[PDB]
């Protein structure tokens, strides 16, 4: 997250870190046994780390649980990043409490102008590299479909939305991928892509979660 703030320990209780020896992506806990993340975060050997603030210090609220199964969206395309969504089943159910909690799925899509909370352990510089140890947060609005398509000609599908600031300076970044965009207490987006980070006229692009709720629910019901 570029241009954000320190969330506060365990204030984003659905935020997970995907670990393969090191943090490599975010995710969101959607029930005791399932995480939503970005398909472009897929790899084998994932450990889901719940209850994290400092990803380099054991602080006392962590739950570390291995993935038992990963399911990339059937229609994911890694060239275009269309359908940039994946589900991860945990080997055991997480213990849910005030600091480790699921986030509601949307029943309705969000609109341009809604404020949302974007979080992660990704890069905090736009023309530099600095990776934080504690979770970072950004409040940002959803942008119009037309401004999104104007920023990224020929690249925005019906499964993507933009959020952020066209002036630059405030955005998600590398290492935030897979993490949440939460608007009015609902998971509306997944950190997906963008040209650089926090660049003028290059807002963040997010997977549009409300398009996937039927797939998510039926996948959970059968797995
Ligand atoms: Ca920790």
| Residues 114 and 4 placed together within one structural domain of the fold | yes
Cα–Cα distance measured from residue 106 to residue 140, given in angstroms and rounded to the nearest whole number: 18
Say if residue 189 is in the same domain as residue 219: no
Pairing of strands 23-31, 34-37: antiparallel
Residues 26 and 52 in one domain: yes
Write down the number of H helices and E strands in the chain: 2, 13
- Catalytic positions, please? 40, 84, 177
Clarify whether residues 60 and 130 are in a common domain.
no
Report residue 154 as tokens: 């020929």
Count of structural domains within the chain: 2
Q: Single out the residue of 50, 173, 181, 52 nearest to residue 115, CA to CA.
A: 181
Query: What does the alpha-carbon distance between residue 170 and residue 216 come to, in Å, rounded to a whole number?
Result: 30
Let me know whether 44 and 154 are in one domain: no
Length in residues, the chain: 223
For 12-39, give the DSSP string: STTEEEEESSSEEEEEEEEETTEEEE-G
Ligand 1 midpoint to CA 48 (Å): 12
Alpha-carbon distance values, 67 to 25, 46, 90, 162 (Å): 14, 6, 5, 30
First-last CA distance in the chain: 33
- Structure obtained using: X-ray
Does one domain contain both 72 and 84? Answer: yes
The CA radius of gyration of the chain, in Å to the nearest whole number, is 16
Distance 59 CA to ligand 1 centre (A): 5
Same domain membership, residue 113 and residue 196 = yes
Instruction: Name the binding residues.
Output: 52, 54, 57, 62, 171-172, 174-175, 177
Question: What's CA 83's distance to the chain center, in Å?
Answer: 14
- Asked whether the beta carbons of 1 and 124 are under 8 A apart, the reply is yes
Q: What region does 183 belong to: left with phi over 0, alpha with psi -120 to 50, or beta? A: beta
Burial class (CB in 10 A: 0-12, 13-18, 19+), 185: exposed
Cα–Cα dist 194/172, whole Å: 9
**Same domain (yes/no): 77, 110:** no
Binding site for Ca(2+), by residue number, is: 52, 54, 57, 62
Report DSSP state, residue 162: E
84 and 131 co-located in one domain: no
Closest CA to 85 of 144, 163, 9, 157: 157
Largest CA distance in the chain: 47
What is the Å distance from ligand 1's center to 17 Cα?
Answer: 10
Q: Residue 15 corresponds to which tokens in the numbers above?
A: 């935020």
Give me the sheet containing 160-163, strands edge to edge. 5-6, 136-141, 115-120, 180-183, 186-193, 204-208, 160-163
| CATH number of the domain that residue 65 is part of | 2.40.10.10
Query: What is the distance in A from the centroid of ligand 1 to the CA of 64?
Result: 10
Bridge partners (DSSP) of residue 86 are: 37, 72
Residues of the domain holding 70: 13-102+211-223
162 and 91 in one domain?
A: no
Q: Answer yes or no: do 64 and 156 share one domain.
A: no
The binding site for substrate comprises: 171-172, 174-175, 177
How far apart, in Å, are the Cα atoms of 170 and each of 35, 57, 203? Answer: 26, 27, 9
| Whether residues 161 and 180 fall in one domain | yes
CA distance linking residue 161 with residue 207, whole number of Å? 7
CA of 98 to the centre of ligand 1 (A): 16
CB-count exposure of residue 126 (10 Å: 0-12, 13-18, 19+): middle
């Amino acid at each position: 997250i570029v241009g954000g703030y320190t969330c506060g320990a365990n204030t984003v209780p659905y935020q997970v870190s995907l670990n393969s020896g090191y943090h490599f992506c975010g995710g969101s806990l959607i029930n005791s046994q399932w995480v939503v993340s970005a398909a472009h975060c897929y790899k084998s050997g994932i450990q889901v780390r719940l209850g994290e603030d400092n990803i380099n210090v054991v602080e006392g609220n962590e739950q570390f649980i291995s993935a038992s199964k990963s399911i990339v969206h059937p229609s994911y395309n890694s060239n275009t990043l269309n359908n940039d969504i994946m589900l991860i089943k945990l080997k055991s159910a997480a213990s849910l409490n005030s600091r480790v909690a699921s986030i509601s799925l949307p029943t309705s899509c969000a609109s341009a102008g809604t404020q949302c909370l974007i979080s992660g352990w990704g890069n905090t510089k736009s023309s530099g590299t600095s990776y934080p140890d504690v979770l970072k947060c950004l409040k940002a609005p959803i942008l119009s479909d037309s401004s999104c398509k104007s920023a990224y000609p020929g690249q925005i599908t019906s499964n993507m939305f933009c959020a952020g600031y066209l002036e630059g300076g405030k955005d998600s970044c590398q290492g935030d991928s897979g993490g949440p965009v939460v608007c009015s207490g609902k998971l509306q987006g997944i950190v997906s892509w963008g040209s650089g980070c926090a660049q003028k006229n290059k807002p963040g692009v997010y997977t549009k979660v409300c398009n996937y709720v039927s797939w998510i629910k039926q996948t959970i019901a059968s797995n």
